[PDB]
Write an enzyme that holds these catalytic residues in place. Sequence first.
Site, short mmCIF file in Angstrom:
data_model
loop_
_atom_site.label_atom_id
_atom_site.label_comp_id
_atom_site.label_asym_id
_atom_site.label_seq_id
_atom_site.Cartn_x
_atom_site.Cartn_y
_atom_site.Cartn_z
CG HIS A 54 42.18 40.15 46.24
ND1 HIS A 54 42.26 39.95 44.89
CD2 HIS A 54 43.04 39.74 47.10
CE1 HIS A 54 42.86 38.63 44.93
NE2 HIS A 54 43.46 38.36 45.94
CG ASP A 56 39.72 39.93 42.58
OD1 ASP A 56 40.13 41.66 43.00
OD2 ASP A 56 40.04 39.22 43.12
CB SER A 67 47.20 36.42 44.88
OG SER A 67 45.03 36.50 44.54
#
Lengths: 29, 237
Positions: free
Chosen positions: B43, B90, B187
């Site tokens: 992502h 992911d 992230s």
Amino acid sequence: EADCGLRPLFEKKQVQDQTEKELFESYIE
Amino acid sequence: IVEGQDAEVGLSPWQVMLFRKSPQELLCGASLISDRWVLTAAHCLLYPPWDKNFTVDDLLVRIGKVEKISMLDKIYIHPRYNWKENLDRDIALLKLKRPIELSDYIHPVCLPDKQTAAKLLHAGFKGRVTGWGNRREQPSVLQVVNLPLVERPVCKASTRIRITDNMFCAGYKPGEGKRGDACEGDSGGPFVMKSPYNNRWYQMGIVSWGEGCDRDGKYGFYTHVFRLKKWIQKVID
Ligand code: NA
């Protein structure tokens, strides 16, 4: 990688970082 | 990193920064897994709702802060990565133009094997999260926080998002004393654990998603590296 996981400034120097004890401690309940 | 602290010099030599080329801003953390390959969240590269489809020349990595900036050659996102629902699978691999020179500040982390699972992926067992993401919901130095792996049912019950076996969650429960979480900018970074077996650090997770940052009754969700090891090995062959 044959040398992965060992930090030049730590595991290669037998110096252990400030929060290492915290980790291994959790392993024993 | 919320409720973390300043890392020591060289604490995470596998730390990679994923930067936007223009305007330059930290987009995501990432990790160094060999002299050539970088591991990160899918992502961080591909999220169509926010209009995001990064190519190799939209981004620059940052390694060691001694700092070696690099351009990527090829991006590989999981074919069954699910951005619509829950960010399943992911995971994404970055191939650097050319091999990087290892140093006291640049060194790759290990990918876990079946034995290393069995031994480390347990509830209560602590892992390490690191990044230059936000401290609240910007740091001067790399931030480190240690957070325990959380039981699978407790993860499922903490959210309404569908949780797959390809994810795990970590953090402290309300009133456990200690706090901490990843935040915007962390992230795609590593969740690393140390093996008592061989004294080596292994990356168990990739910072994937959470509802907010360091909230009570909520947990950060991380991509299960080992469970996606086959795919990582496949794209390298
Ligand atoms: Na939390």
